[PDB]
């Protein structure tokens, strides 16, 4: 449900949208 599909998934966009925010974290 979200274990590894949308929370990062290695980006989601919260990992990338949080890999610094892929820019700002």
C-alpha angle 12/19/2, rounded to 5°?
A: 30
Q: Which domain holds residue 20?
A: 1-25
Instruction: Give how far Cα 10 sits from Cα of 3, 4, 6, 18, Å.
Output: 11, 8, 9, 9
Measured in residues, the chain has a length of: 25
Cα 2 to chain centroid distance, Å, stands at: 12
Tally of domains in the chain? 1
């Amino acid at each position: 449900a979200g274990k590894e599909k949308i929370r990062k998934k290695l980006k989601n966009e919260i990992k990338k949208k949080w890999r610094k925010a892929v820019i700002a974290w």
